[PDB]
């Protein structure tokens, strides 16, 4: 699902490459087949709001929101498993599930890093990707809920992912 890649990029630390490929993304969002017209609009609003900021200023807001705290962490297993040892085995089992689909970590991010996990989902058949979102949907909803409390438009990206889940 191109939508899953698109959200994966928008949910990551705002990279300069976002600004120089905004045209490509705006068009992909516009021609989206998996999102109703109103949600594609909301996603395009988000991208436009993001890339009218200077990346340095986008990066600073992102960190104030996702890198300062645990309640807004993008490591999924930090929301699933309370014991650190449980998280470990979960990460291993997720790494193996990646290896099963012929995918190998080529990053310095953890396996349950949501943007990374979305990249994995996007490689799957439609149904296989949709189940993935259903699997983490209580996490998606908590994060969205929390972001709304902080009155942050990143919540939009979680609602869109939840929408894609049904």
């Amino acid at each position: 699902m191109i939508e899953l890649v698109i959200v994966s990029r928008l949910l990551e630390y705002p990279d300069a490459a976002l600004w120089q490929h905004q045209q490509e993304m705006f068009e992909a969002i516009a021609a989206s087949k998996n999102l109703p017209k109103e949600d594609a609009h909301a996603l395009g609003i988000f991208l436009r709001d993001l890339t009218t900021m200077d990346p340095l200023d986008a990066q600073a807001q992102y960190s104030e929101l996702f890198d300062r705290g645990r309640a807004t962490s993008l490591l999924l297993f930090e929301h699933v498993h309370g014991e650190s040892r449980d998280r470990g085995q979960a990460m291993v089992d997720l790494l193996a599930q990646y290896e099963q689909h012929g995918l190998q970590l080529n990053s310095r991010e953890l396996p349950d890093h949501l943007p990374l996990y979305l990249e994995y989902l996007a490689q799957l058949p439609q149904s296989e990707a949709v189940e993935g979102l259903k699997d983490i949907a209580p996490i998606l909803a908590l994060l969205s809920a929390r972001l709304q409390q902080r009155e942050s438009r990143y919540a939009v990206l979680f609602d869109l992912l939840l929408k894609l889940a049904n």
Binding site: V5, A17, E24, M25, G102, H113, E119
Partner: peptide, 13 residues
Amino acid sequence: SKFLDRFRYFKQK
């Protein structure tokens, strides 16, 4: 190559 078709976290085996 289109941006959205370039991997950012993974590679093939």
